[PDB]
Design a protein around this nucleic acid. Sequence first.
RNA 1: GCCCGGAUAGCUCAGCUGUAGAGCAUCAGACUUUUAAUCUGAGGGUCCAGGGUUCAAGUCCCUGUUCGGGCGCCA
RNA 2: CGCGACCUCAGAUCAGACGUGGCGACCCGCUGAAUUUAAGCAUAUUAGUCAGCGGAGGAAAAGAAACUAACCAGGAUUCCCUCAGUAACGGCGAGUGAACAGGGAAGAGCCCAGCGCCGAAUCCCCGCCCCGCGGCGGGGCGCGGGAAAUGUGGCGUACGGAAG
RNA 3: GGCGCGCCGGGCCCGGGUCUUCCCGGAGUCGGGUUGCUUGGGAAUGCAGCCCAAAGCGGGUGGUAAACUCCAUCUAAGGCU
RNA 4: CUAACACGUGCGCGAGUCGGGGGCUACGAAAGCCGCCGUGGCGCAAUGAAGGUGAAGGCCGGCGGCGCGCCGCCGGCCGAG
RNA 5: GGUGUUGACGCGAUGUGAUUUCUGCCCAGUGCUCUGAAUGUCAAAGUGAAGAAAUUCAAUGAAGCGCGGGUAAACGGCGGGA
RNA 6: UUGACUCUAGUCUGGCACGGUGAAGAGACAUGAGAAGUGUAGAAUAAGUGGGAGGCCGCCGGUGAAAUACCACUACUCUGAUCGUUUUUUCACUGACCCGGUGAGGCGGGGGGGCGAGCCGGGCUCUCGCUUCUGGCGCCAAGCGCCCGGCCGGCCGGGCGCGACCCGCUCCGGGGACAGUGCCAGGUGGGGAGUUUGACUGGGGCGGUACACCUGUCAAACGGUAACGCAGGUGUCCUAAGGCGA
Lengths: 51, 206
Amino acid sequence: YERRAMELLKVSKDKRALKFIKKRVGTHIRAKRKREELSSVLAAMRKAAAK
Amino acid sequence: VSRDTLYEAVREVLHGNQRKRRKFLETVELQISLKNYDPQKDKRFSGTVRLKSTPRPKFSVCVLGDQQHCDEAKAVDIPHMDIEALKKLNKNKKLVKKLAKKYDAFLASESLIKQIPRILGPGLNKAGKFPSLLTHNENMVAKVDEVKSTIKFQMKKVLCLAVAVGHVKMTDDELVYNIHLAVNFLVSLLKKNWQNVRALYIKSTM
RNA sequence: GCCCGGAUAGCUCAGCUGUAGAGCAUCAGACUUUUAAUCUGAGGGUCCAGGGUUCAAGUCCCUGUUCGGGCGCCA
RNA sequence: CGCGACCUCAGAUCAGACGUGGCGACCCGCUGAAUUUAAGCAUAUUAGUCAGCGGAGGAAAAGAAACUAACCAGGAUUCCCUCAGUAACGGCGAGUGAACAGGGAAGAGCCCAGCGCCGAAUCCCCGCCCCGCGGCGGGGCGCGGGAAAUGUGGCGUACGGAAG
RNA sequence: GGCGCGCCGGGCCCGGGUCUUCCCGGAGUCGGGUUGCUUGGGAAUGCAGCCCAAAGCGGGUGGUAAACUCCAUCUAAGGCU
RNA sequence: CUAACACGUGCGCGAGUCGGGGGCUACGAAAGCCGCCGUGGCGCAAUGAAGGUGAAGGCCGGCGGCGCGCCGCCGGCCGAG
RNA sequence: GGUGUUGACGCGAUGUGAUUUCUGCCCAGUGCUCUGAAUGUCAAAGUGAAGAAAUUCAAUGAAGCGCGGGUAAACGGCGGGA
RNA sequence: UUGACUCUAGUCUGGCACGGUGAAGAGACAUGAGAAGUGUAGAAUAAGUGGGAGGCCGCCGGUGAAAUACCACUACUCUGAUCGUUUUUUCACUGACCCGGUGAGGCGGGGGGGCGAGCCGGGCUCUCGCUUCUGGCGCCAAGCGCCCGGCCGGCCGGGCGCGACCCGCUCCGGGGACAGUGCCAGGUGGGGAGUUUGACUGGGGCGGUACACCUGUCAAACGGUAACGCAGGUGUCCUAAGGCGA
Ligand SMILES: [Mg+2]
Ligand SMILES: [Mg+2]
Ligand SMILES: [Mg+2]
Ligand SMILES: [Mg+2]
Ligand SMILES: [Mg+2]
Ligand SMILES: [Mg+2]
Ligand SMILES: [Mg+2]
Ligand SMILES: [Mg+2]
Ligand SMILES: [Mg+2]
Ligand SMILES: [Mg+2]
Ligand SMILES: [Mg+2]
Ligand SMILES: [Mg+2]
Ligand SMILES: [Mg+2]
Ligand SMILES: [Mg+2]
Ligand SMILES: [Mg+2]
Ligand SMILES: [Mg+2]
Ligand SMILES: [Mg+2]
Ligand SMILES: [Mg+2]
Ligand SMILES: [Mg+2]
Ligand SMILES: [Mg+2]
Ligand SMILES: [Mg+2]
Ligand SMILES: [Mg+2]
Ligand SMILES: [Mg+2]
Ligand SMILES: [Mg+2]
Ligand SMILES: [Mg+2]
Ligand SMILES: [Mg+2]
Ligand SMILES: [Mg+2]
Ligand SMILES: [Mg+2]
Ligand SMILES: [Mg+2]
Ligand SMILES: [Mg+2]
Ligand SMILES: [Mg+2]
């Protein structure tokens, strides 16, 4: 579910991404935290793929 | 945003002085891309950045002033253009737009923005060219320096922004402090916070 | 009510920065026995009202009526 | 092919131990109805009750906050008075129905795993000698056998803690 | 039998305050959805099955569901008395 | 017979009342005592769904205010149908 | 697990009751069965949008019902007035 | 008992999990690359924002325009193709899972041998591997080769390998990511359960409503007064058939 969420953040449909994590994890606070953590991981991957 | 990555970006531009060995006066800029902010919808943002380095420094000024400005503006070598000069400026809308092509930004006294909207308020608001007001502190000393580098984040219909901060010869922690203030002011100015951006790009001019 | 779709000359329809087009109609001229039909041409819109972006928009977006279409009510 | 380590897995009338079953007034876990009430009855009520089943002790269970509060804050559990037949549930009908706070009975706190650091510094079992032995323990001796690095013992546990 | 005294042997060679440097936590569990039972617990008090199934300035509670935001209070998913 | 309620009646105290739960000192598991054991129940205050609010007034003097003889407020007096 | 130490000349469920002579008509009703492709109807989950979220809204669309055949040794039924 | 009410084991169907491995087909995308960005004026095919004055040996000014011009890295849209993410359809694989057989007895490759085809003693492709006139018997090794042991070449007594080919990862087959189970959801469900099945009444039942109301009577000159007494009526209708005035 994390890989499909990272892929939705890669395509950047963030609202359906957030609804996906909150349906498959639970509380909306936890969903905001996991979306922000996956965006940080995906940003680290973008920096590593840059250089 | 992390700050050691901004340290990485500023080390790569100071040693990407290698990358060009630039041949003009040298400056850089930062660029902003944003995710799903629909430009034709509401909440359109246009805010000025209060910044404490003047990253332009070759900044082109002429002022529009009343008296008390004559001797001090000619002592500090700044064009004081009074109302009869403004009459000569107002008799043609062709040359007055080409001196704004010469001169980068303006600033005007307290009562002369009652005489600029005669016909020429709508005449030369056709550049995005606000003349900024002075005060009754009556000092353009350091106020020209702090009204320059009040940088306009503007929402127009293209979904990209590019703001000139950084010449590569200032000191590095103060320039990343400039980028710090600018980006958190933009994140505050937006409809929503730091999630609203795509990617911030601080690559050089050339 | 609600996304939804529309308003363009008397009547129907095309059309991202202007001579608003095509037809049906009305007006006048020629043929005619005569506008009965033919044919020639015109005139004829404050692009539904307003606001906004834009270099200006009838077109793009909001706001408000107005009507078209099923769901909501009811039995 | 054989020999040997380990890992899984058997077999023993092997050496030493242990559980079974009973009573069940009080206790703990699960299961668990219907007569009855609602003037009928189906939700509810009877009722987490009778029956059933498992398991203990001299008491059991509980228990040292992922608490109560919203105040000038209290401070494990259990039991009593009270909160109260109140807040609350209920064909909002019949009926059901807690808790906090206060006063009392009593009063007691602690320990691992992890984080670590100490030459596994730890434990079990056999043999011999001394002592005591109707709760098989203390001391020494063993080039005696095992367990344990897939982690024992010492310090250390949220009230912080360790080292210098 | 207990409270008392003495002797022999064994075990332990232990503490407190200040400063500095470090270190710190229990997962198919929490939580969410659904179903069933139960509770006074009412947009679900507790319990369980199935599915989804985490995080670490986190997580739970804060008696009306939900979002934003201050606070308050504890530290679950290990154990003894 | 136990519990609950209502009313009448006797008894003590009376805006208070009650120690029933706890404690201290043969019949006696009685009896007495506590009072900084009145925590608490009931009563002394009602009304509202709730936020909440929460049970006489007048006369005298000074300052139509005008087409608050009323008086807004201050000092005195009567003072509880 | 029975049928089953069985396999359609068997197992299982029905009606009628030897033989002889026959077994007429009706699928409209209620059943049962056969096919899934028109408008239909249709749950949970999954999908798309709006919204801060709870939530709301839309499309999708399983069986079964509808719709369309077959069947009376299936339950049953088989005229009236001049 | 059923066409009663409320449910129920069972059964049908869908979803989720167990639940994998490929390959094609249809796609949505992402990423990389490659070309398009002609209202009008302006030498101009200016899509857009921002930076910028000599890169290389066009420009900065000035011209028209709203908006400019080396450069760079951006952000938009569109068009053909490559790659990796997901959905879906079909065809396969075995490894979870299911079924059968047995005393789990020769499975799959490979080597060796013989019978048929044809090219010049040769190899490839394919097949085969020893039992069919008879109500017989069939095991517990013959033969071969190599070692070794006791006694005096002879005796007596052993062991090993071929005979009975070698190597391997499921015992063979048959299904297979569906059957099936676990949990939901909808259908069906007198097979089974629990319950109900008004009242009045010249007995109940069928009838009727005298069960809620209205007028005249009964009603005995206040009011009240009964029966399944009498004769009738109602579960509406009215934007005026309401309210004024003439
Ligand atoms: Mg033994
Ligand atoms: Mg026992
Ligand atoms: Mg009853
Ligand atoms: Mg009764
Ligand atoms: Mg009864
Ligand atoms: Mg109950
Ligand atoms: Mg109860
Ligand atoms: Mg019992
Ligand atoms: Mg005992
Ligand atoms: Mg205990
Ligand atoms: Mg604790
Ligand atoms: Mg307590
Ligand atoms: Mg009371
Ligand atoms: Mg009721
Ligand atoms: Mg308490
Ligand atoms: Mg005490
Ligand atoms: Mg340890
Ligand atoms: Mg139960
Ligand atoms: Mg209950
Ligand atoms: Mg809050
Ligand atoms: Mg613990
Ligand atoms: Mg605990
Ligand atoms: Mg009395
Ligand atoms: Mg028959
Ligand atoms: Mg039929
Ligand atoms: Mg029925
Ligand atoms: Mg049935
Ligand atoms: Mg029945
Ligand atoms: Mg009756
Ligand atoms: Mg009378
Ligand atoms: Mg009338």
